[PDB]
Every structure is written in C-alpha cells, then in structure tokens.
Write a structure and sequence with these properties.
The structure is a homotetramer. With about 400 residues, the first copy, chain A, is α/β, with parallel strands linked by helices. Chain A has helices at about 10-25, 40-50, 60-75, 85-105, 120-130, 145-150, 155-160, 240-255, 280-295, 300-320, 325-335, 370-390, and strands spanning about 5, 25-35, 55-60, 110, 135-140, 175-180, 185, 215-225, 225-230, 240, 260-265, 270-280, 340-350, 350-360. In chain A, the strands form 3 sheets. In chain A, strands 3-2-1-4-5 form a 5-stranded parallel β-sheet, with helices on both faces. In chain A, helix 8 packs across helix 9 (about 280-295). The PDB classes it as ligase.
C-alpha cells in the first residue's frame, strides 16, 4: 500500500535496501538518475524490477545538471577549501529535487536513499527533501537501528538469500562516485593520506605523463558568465550546445591529463577525509571563467564576491543548495556576472590549462584620465591615516 | 647639509635623480637593495659614488625577504584576485623599511625614490614611509612639477646624464627579484595578444621541461617551510634562503610558475601582466595541502574569507598598517601546528600533492544515530522557510 | 555661452560661487534641491537671481528622498561605525543625480558644487557625477587654486563688492546640514570631543529631559521591508503615504526626545570628526524594522546580511551609492527583505524607542519538529571537531 | 566507585539528578556556581550533602565572570542579531570550565549537568566539556532515554523527591546572573503579547526612574574598564567586580537595559525573550564611543564585519573553540590603545555619550589639492563602469 520513491543506483547497498523495503511491505518505486555516469541504465532498470520494484523511472538529467547546476556553481568559481570543484555536491540537489517531484507525481508519502550514515551525501539528500517538501517522510536505512544491526559480508549474504542479482565480477577497491562533472575515489588504500595513489586509481583522465606531447588551443566564449561556445583552434571543432560543449571540454581535458586533485577535505558530518578527484572539463571552464572576469568585472565587486566565495562553496558542499542563504548569495553573484561576456584562449598541454589571451566587448580594451598630480593626492590622503597611527602608537 | 637617503637602482632614472638632488645641494646617501635581482652591485656602488653620493649602502636583503616577507604572505596563501602571487608587492615594503632605518641611522631628514608617477610601486614606497616614520620628508621627482617640466622624455634624461657626466634591451617593462620576474607593457598591453615564448626568461616552457617527474618532500613547522628533500636525487635544504632558491631552481627547470592575467591596479584601472614565480608556486601549493590535514575547518573557512583582504593589503601597499597587524594576529594563530610534510610531484608545469603527513592530525567518535539528529536540527529551519513562504 | 548647473544652497559659499562663475563668463543655472530643509526657497531663488543666475530650478525631492534613498538605506539597517544613520550621505547622491539630469536637459557642459575642499560631501557629489555622466565637466571652486587663494573674512568682503545679499543676522556658531532625515551639527566648540554639547546645539528634537512624561505607542507596518502604515494607538492618527508617514515619525520622535547622537566618526577625506546628529523619525523606523526582522528573516540570511552591513554603510558614507559594488549588495539585501512583512508596536518615551510586540503572517507564530535524541546527535557531531583541537593543543607544541 | 562532578543548582531537576546518580552508584561531587544569582548557597550546600553528595564545591566565580568573560565579550561589543548582549551564553562556558577543573582535581571521570534536552544551555556545557577535556564522560539525564521514561513530567520529579527523601512562583522561565535576568515562555511566548510591567524584576521602568540625569565617567585601558566615577556624587570604583556591580546599580535605578526581542536559537528555531542587562548596556555603549576616538578606521571596519560571527560563536557555545581563538587574537590587537575616558549621561533608560578623551588620539596634513587627486583616482573606475552599462546589454 504505502509507496516509497527510492534513489536507486543499481549497486549492492540500494539493491539490498530495495528488497528490504519490499519485504517490509512497501510499494517501492525505483528512481534512477542519469547525471552522466557511464552505467548500463537498461541493466539497472532490469535489476530493480528483478529485485522487486513496482516501477522504474530512468531520468535523463544531464542537460539540466549542466545548465542549472554546474553553471550555477561556476557563477562563484566555486571551490571548497581552495581546491575541490564540488562534483558530487553539485549533483545531489538535482537528484533529490527530481526524486521529490516523482514522489509528488506518484502520491508517494516516502522518499528513501542509500547514502551512508557517516558521510555527506545523506545531508545533501535530506536537506533538499526538507527544503522542497517537508511533508514527505524520509527513509534512511543506514541510520535505522534495525537495518544497522542486520548489516554491520552481511549485504552479499542477504542478496544471495533473497534472490537479488549480484555483480558478476570484482568491484574496484575504492568508493567511487561518477557523473558528468567528475569521478571521485575514496577509501581503501586512499584512506591513508600518506599513501600515494597509483595510476589505476584514475579512471577518466590520462596522466599528464601519458598525455600527448602537443598543445591544444581552445577558445571558450561566455555570455554573462555562462559558456556559449568552445572552438578548437587546432582542428576546427566548434560546440555551441551547452551539454555538448561541456562534454567536449571533458574529452579534451581527459585526453590531456587535466583535472586531477588529491586532497584532504573537512566533511560536514565527520572530521577529515582524503579524496582523489578527476574533473577534466570543469577544471578548464573554471580557469577560463576567472580569466575573463579579470578583464570584465569591477574590482570592488570581484573583491566582495571573492570574500563570499568560500561561503558559497560551503553552502554547496554542506547541502544548502535550496536554502534562503544560497538565494541571498546567488542574487548578488548573478549580478556580478552581468557582462562577463567575451572569449578566452586557453593552452592545454599535459595537465596545464593556461589562459594566453582574452577579449571582451565590455572592457576598456574594446578598440586612463589621470596624471601624476592625481596620484600624489590619492597617496597623501591614504597616507594620512598611517601617519596618525604612528604619531600616537 | 641636509641628508637624503635615495633608493638607488643604478638605472637611468635614479642616476639622474642622484645628480639632480646633489645639484640642489643635498648630501645624498645611495641605498642599493639586493632582493635577488641579477645586478652588478659593485658597479652600481662605484657609479653612485662617481655621480655624487657621499656614501653608499649595498644591502643584501635576500634572506630577510624570504623569512619575513615571502613567508609572511605564505601565512594566508596570499593570492591577489585569485591568481597573482604578489612578487613585486611583497619586496617593496622591505626595501622601503630598510631605507627608513638607514635615514634614521644617518640622521637624514629626507627619503627619495624613483618610482613612476602613475604606477603602484610609488604607493608601496610612500605608505611604508608614512607608516614607519612620518617625520621623514619624502622626495618623489616623478610627481614633482619642476622635475616633470625638465624631463619630459627619455632623451632629456640621457642628455642631462651626458651634460653632468653621469656614467651611461627588451620591449617589456620587467621587475625581477628572488620571488619572480614580471613582464608587462609593449605588445603585452593588449590582452588579446598571445605572449611569444621569448617573453619568458626564467622558467623553461612545460613543453621543453624534462619528461620525468621530480618528487619533493617539503616540511613545515607552524606554517613555515623548514626542509626540502628531493626524493630521487637526495638533495636536502634546511636553510630558508637555500631552500627557497632550490624551489626556484626545481620550478624553473620544470616549467612551473607561469601566469598570464589582467589585474585591477590600485592606481590606475586594469593591466595585463605575465609573471614567472617558480619556487613560490610550489610552496603555496604544498602549504595549502598541509593545511588540509592540520587546520580546523572553521578556522580555515574564516581565514579563506579574509584571504582576499589580506592579498589586497599586500597589493595596495598596506604591509605596515594597523589592519594588516589585525589580520596577521589571526592568520599566525591559524598556522599554529601547520606542521608536517607534503610530497609533491613536479612535472612539466604541474605541481601535484600526492601524499602528506602531520604529527598533529588524527591520522597520527560518532555513530549514524548522531548524524540523524544533526541533520534533523539543521533541516528544521529549512522546513519552516518552506511552510511559511 | 558656457552653461553650468550649480548646486545652490543660498548660503555665503554658493552665492559667491554663483557670482564668480558669472564674472568668469558662464551662463549659470542655479539648482536648489528641496530635501526637507526648513529654508525659504522663495527667498533663495530671488537671492540666486539677485546674485546673477540666469535661471533657477527649485526641485521638490522629499518624496523621492524617502522612497528611493532613506528606504533603500533601511534595507540594510545602515549604520556607519555602529551608530551613524547617514542622513547627509543618503541625501547627496539624490541631489547630485537630479543635478546631472538638469544639466542634461539643459545641455549644460558643466556641473558645479560648493562643498568644501577638505570634507566628505565633495566626494559624494563627484563620485555620483562620474557614475552617471562622465561627459560632464566638474567645477569645484574649493579645490581650484585661484578661487582658493582669494578666499583663504574674504567671502563676505567679495559679496559686498558684487552686490551679493548677505545674511541680516548672526549665524549659529556650528556647521549645520539639515534635511528630512536629520540635522547635523559640527565644528565650532563641538570640534573638541571632550566638550559636552549644550542644549542650544540641538534644533529639532526636544531633550529627553524636556519630553512629555507620557508614553506614545505606535504600530508600524511593513511590506517586504518597506514601511507602509503608521498608526498612533493612543490618538488614532494613521498615515500610509511614504512621505506623510515618515514626516509623522519625525514629529513623534522630535516631540519625545528621540534620535540624538554624539560621536566621533572616521571620515573618508580626512581622519576623524566629532558630530552631533538629530534623526528622530529614522531612529524609530530602523529600530522597528530590525524588530520585525527578528520574527521574519532566516537566521543564516540575517547573519550574512549583518556581516555585510558595515560595508553597505561604508559605501553610502563614502559616496559609492551609484557603484557596481552597491548594486551587488543591494541585489542580496533586497532578496533578504522579501516577506519582511508585518507590524511592530513600539513604545516611545523620553528618548526611548522600545519594541513591545510584533506580528507577521509569514512566520511560525502565525496561528515539535525535533526531540532530545536529535539534540544529542547535533551536539555530538559538533563536539567531534573540538575534541580534535584539544588532543593537539594538549601535547608538545613545536 | 566512579566519581561524577554534577553542576548543581539546588532546584528540583538537579536535586533529583543528584539522588538518581547516587542510586546508580556514583560518588557525586556537587558543584555550585555562584555567578551572581540571588540564591542561598549555604542552604544549597546543605541540601546537596543531605541528598547524598560526598563533597560540595561552592565557587564564587563573580569576579572571573567579569574580568575573563564579560570583558572578553566587550572586546567585540558582542551583540547577537543586533541586540542581544548574551548574558546567559557568556556565563555558561565559565561554569562548565570550572566544573572540568574540579573533575580534574578530584580525578573524576564524569561530568553531569541538568540542562534541558531541547534548549541552548546544554550545548554550551557540552561543547565546553569537549573543547577542554574530551576524556571526561558526559552525563545528561534529560537526553537519556531511561531518565526521560521515568520522569515524563514535573509530578514524577516531585514524587521521586518525596519517595527518596530529597528535601523539598512566576509564570516565566528565568535565568539570572550578574550580567542579566532573562524572562521567556508563558505569555511571553506569543511575540504579539506586550509584557506586563510585572515581568521586569531588576530594572525600574524608565517611567519610574528619577527625573534627573546621572553623569558617569568610565575609563578604559586597552579596551578594559579600569575606573568608574559618578560626577555628581563622587562615587569611584576601580576593582572590576565593584565597578561592574556599580554600573548595574546605576543602570537598574535609572531604567536602563531592557530588551524585548525574538532571537534565532542554535537548537530550535525562534524564541521571544525579555532581558534586563543594566550594567553591560552602559559599558557596551561607553566602550563603542571610546573606539570612535581611538581605533583605526580600517581595523574598526574589519572588526565590525566579523562582530556578528564573534557573537554567534558565543551564543552557540563555541567559547573555547579554535575559531574563537582566531578571532580573539585579532580583536585583542584591535583594542591596543583603546584607552581613555567617556562621559555618559544616564537618564530614564537612555545612555548617551556626551564627551570623551584619549591620550592616544590627535585630539591629545593634507590640502584641497590632495582631495582632488584622491577623488579623481576613485572616480576612474566608476567612469569605466558607466561607459559599459550604457551599452547594448547582451
């Protein structure tokens, strides 16, 4: 009778959860969000149904992910703790929002997810549920005392026992998340921050060492801070559709060893965690975007935006995408992107993304009025305050 | 009778100014600051004396530049407008401060400088003078109406040098010190002009750099670099000046540290610059990586929020200001126990942290039930916003 | 003929400038901005013509001042250096903007002002001119070496020679600026910050000592952070028009001794200055508005807004009203005011403005979501990080 | 065998908790903090022993409350959400710190408190325990499922007290210490309910206060109050406790320090409170006035930008956190040479600075030509912006 919409990935955790909820008497709808992971969605839907789902939704969210999520983060050049481009964090609110909309469509009273009881993704799901429809009841088995006792090999044994299909070959020994923006790799041997990742940790980018010994020049065009065109100046390739252009940046980046990050981050739930991230396309876009801002944005606007950029990234990381405070910052950050319009040429070569030229119709260089006397005054007035401080303390 | 301490580079501008002040009857002390530029300081001393200087100070300020200036910027991972590592801005307060101290030593009543009338460096000189000894009178010929009347162009400077018997390459304006070389103006002034490889003079291009990675272990204590070890060839540096120069060599040989950007000026509006900062690029990246494993999250968030302001103060010339003192109090506090070592892979322009260790981390206490409460309290506020709006 | 639009106040400085610009061969348009000063604008316009002006614009800007300037500052509860409600600073950009618009209507090539060469108002004028129309040339006689040399008693002597009328009685011995929002008093004896102002410094508010020993209760209603009604709960007066409502708050405040401030502020041009300010109506509105925000605004939004509110006030003080950075902040600050809608009851008594009640349809109080187990988890997760800091500061510190 | 140091108030909840812990077999040490509340501490100590505590510590923390907590908040003119002077929040870390110190002294392995399970004080206790000694085990009966099952309501507490021989007014929840008294809940819970004058118990109303102003001169050194002088009656205090109590007396007599607001909670959402903070209201106003003549503009601007965060840390219970240490380093630096005296007029609720003086000011060098350059350089950037907003906007 009772319906639950379960965020279903096809992996062992959500497959066990799906069976388990069916066994508890729920009508389970499996919701499969395609945000660019290189998964077999046909197989995943079959697995859900064989596991007991009444109905499967396979939702192609890739274009929306790009235009309304990745490009929104781009407004702040969002980087968490100086470094992390937030690939998992940017996807989760989109995935949860769509889950909310499906539950409303189905008249389901419950949403469920299989995020772990001790990570960040659980927060990103649940804060979104709360922000969009607080009337939906939330099921999180990894925080359920009963589930937690049963599954402290317990998951595989239960799959075998209950007729849940299981993977026909060994899983990679890392916890990995993948979407159109990045692949993350955590846990296993990576848990020790003094352990150097071996090359097999990486699955998208080639290493800078293996990347071709030849430069590629791209021109990336923006309008009010949004990418609108990528042109390969070597081979002539041109992309204008936002999804295709972003995918093309991923391709160029990955081929050329761009976008690897190895860091220890502070979690929202927990203390610290070591992650290895591969972000080929967004790495390129963020660098190009900042370069155009250099020639277009007012100095004082940039300074204030940069002051607030850590907060913007924190809100994304923590799961407050759909929060009043995010709306406050976005109002200003969007205003700052007005007339961030023009084109940047980037040289791409063995891991390096180097702006070499840029142009904007909205700059002084579209083909000042002071003198040395003005400088003298400007200095003298600023200096006054410093003299006073000295003549006292 | 009246003494002036002139910041003397040996170039045309300051040699002219030396003579000019001497002609006005000042006793000029020439102050020559060695901050790592490639100059013949012996020659410059001799020229100063021959031009009129009663005395010459040649000050080797390299070690102080590293320990008290570059390592101070490092406290905030200082980067102006996202990108710029401030090589010109970090040196100038040091040079100006030593100038003030000499004037105090000599009982000189004036300090003078030859920076230009529409750039940033004049501000960095004069704000340091003001902050450290407001009693000193400041001479700035390039903002002096009489000087500007007389020296309308380079030919005027050159002719005067010939008349007065003053002794005596690239189409870019360039500043060089231990931390960086900058290249601006000329063809670079157009931000749509791609710099020729010939613009770069310190770092090899990534394209020409060795096809084998270098691995360095960089050790820090309270945010201060204390050791560099080359993991493949065994080189170890512990002296701060030697370790910094070694980072410069490893970066330059491997194509690290190039930046091409347009920055907002303090005096003026926007300028396109090309900068080569090999060693500090490495250091800043290594430092941020160690902070990842050592710093409290909330400290880091606040520090990062304030880091643009910290960089702005450095850029604008407010090194010796009350507001810089305020920020440094906090930023130094944040660096307590930023202690450990980082392994970085250096390869054709890339500087990649691959491993790190600190004795002051939990790599040297809750359950899932707790997460449920943490989430629910946080979510409350969001549910209200929805129910009401 | 060269046409200049001069910001003309009718006082000694601008009358001399008017004359002088006539004597230098300009066609001068005198622009007189009525922003609520209690001046005889008929006499000012005549003085302008007697002094040589070709034409006079007397512009009633009071309503616009309230709705587009005072109410804009209110969005941030703007207070400069914790205290100053910015009455002079909020008026100058409106005055300068209208001046630019009159120069453009008239095809004047120049705008001019008489603000002093060493104060803040000059900046507020000239940054507005630059922001709105950089093609206009700016005349500032108090920064003009010639004008400056002549007028180091020298102004009064020149007025006499040129037939310029001068004031028929002694001026109050303070520098005073007045508009609908405040009266300011500086200089003279107030220059010494250890000098206690005597009661004759004050010219709008009664002192709290002199105010009636009787409370007044007002209800102030807001919609999206904008005042939309004032009701006197004792005597029934009601006002909804923004100008009338603001004037009424001025009246109630002044009668009840509200809005006096004595402080030393840091100038933008210069160092420090001691000022005495009387801001009766806005003092009330600012207090009421913050009280309503208590029941309506999200906590994290309020926190961010309050972090940025010093910058917002700085921008107003310094003259950057029409700057890109102000537009950036205002986008966020306006967003924070959505649904700041409701009513606040304030008790007004001998200088005190005390919120006693408030209501909003957009709040949880418009006529259970966690338990002690939730608290435990929330505390435990927050405590984790602190436990690590302790087991780090405890040990040997190298 | 195992020792617990319980923060003991003498009220019903902590008396029940003392007995309950004793019955579970703990050796309970009762810690009684005197932070200025008007309690009979002699009676409380006797009750604790009567109820089963093995030892009682009655700690007079009033002077330390002033010098190390109230004066620390003063460094940032701390005001939460524009208005709240943090009376409850400032006292709790002190109380908790001394509790940890007693536990350390007694070799106790547990600390306990009786703060409620859905309030803010429990956080202030427990974050302080975590920050100062994470080895201590924490007992919080109001978040313990067993205690909560047993004591579903006040009647259960009362019956247990009777049953176990535990010895033993206003329709508001009230917190009282040297800095303030707070009043919440009951009828005040409705923010549209105007508080009756009877809600107020410390300060007289402005309406009832004397119709004559009092003039005080308050002297500071490096942001710390060092002297108060009454200019009309000659009273003078320099000791920090005496001076603060004197400000409380003058404020309360003259109707100063009342606040009625809705604040956002840390645990929970919004709450309406009425607060009476006579002395500190005076001190905060005086302090800000002195800063006007002493502090550098840019320091003041940065400090004020950070002041909301400073107040948040205090409210939330992060007094002993690394991020607080970070801010304190800077905020203390800002107070160097905040030294001088301020004269305030106090009259029927008003605290008005009327004069001030510092030896560290120009009250103890540019020209008009300079203004022209300063303005022109600043204007450049605005002229560029205009020549780009006037364009076709794509």
């Amino acid at each position: 009778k009772e319906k639950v919409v379960l965020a279903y990935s096809g992996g062992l955790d959500t497959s066990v959860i799906l069976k388990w909820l069916c066994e508890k008497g729920f009508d389970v709808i499996a919701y499969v969000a395609n945000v660019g992971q290189k998964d077999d969605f046909v197989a995943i839907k079959e697995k859900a149904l064989k596991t007991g789902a009444s109905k499967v939704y396979v939702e192609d969210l890739r274009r929306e992910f790009v235009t309304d999520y990745i490009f929104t983060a781009l407004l702040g050049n969002a980087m968490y703790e100086g470094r992390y481009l937030l690939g998992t964090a940017i996807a989760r609110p989109l995935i949860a929002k769509r889950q909310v909309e499906i539950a409303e469509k189905e008249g389901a009273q419950y949403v469920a997810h299989g995020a772990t009881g001790k990570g960040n993704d659980q927060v990103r799901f649940e804060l979104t549920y709360a922000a969009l429809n607080p009337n939906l009841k939330v099921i999180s088995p990894w925080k359920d005392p009963e589930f937690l006792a049963k599954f402290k090999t317990d998951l595989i044994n239960y799959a075998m026992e209950k007729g849940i299909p299981i993977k026909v070959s060994k899983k990679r020994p890392y916890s990995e998340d993948e979407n159109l923006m990045h692949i993350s790799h955590e846990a296993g041997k990576l848990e020790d921050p003094a352990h150097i990742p071996d090359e097999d940790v990486f699955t998208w980018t080639v290493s800078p060492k293996d990347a071709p010994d030849e430069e590629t020049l791209l021109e990336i065009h923006f309008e009010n801070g949004i990418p609108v065109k990528v042109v390969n100046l070597k081979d002539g390739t041109e992309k204008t559709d936002p999804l295709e252009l972003f995918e093309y940046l991923n391709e160029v980046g990955a081929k050329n060893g761009v976008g690897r990050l190895d860091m220890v981050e502070n979690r929202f739930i927990g203390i610290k965690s070591r992650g290895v991230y591969e972000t080929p396309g967004a790495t390129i876009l963020w660098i190009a975007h900042r370069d155009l801002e250099g020639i277009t944005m007012d100095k004082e606007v940039m300074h204030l935006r940069d002051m607030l950029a850590p907060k913007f990234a924190e809100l994304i990381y923590n799961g407050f995408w759909f929060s009043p405070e995010m709306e406050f910052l976005l109002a200003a950050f969007r205003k700052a992107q007005e007339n961030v319009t023009g084109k940047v040429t980037v040289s791409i070569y063995k891991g390096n993304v180097m702006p070499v030229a840029r142009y904007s119709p909205y700059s002084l260089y579209n083909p000042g009025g002071f003198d040395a006397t003005d400088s003298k005054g400007f200095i003298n007035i600023h200096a006054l305050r410093l003299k006073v401080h000295q003549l006292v303390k």
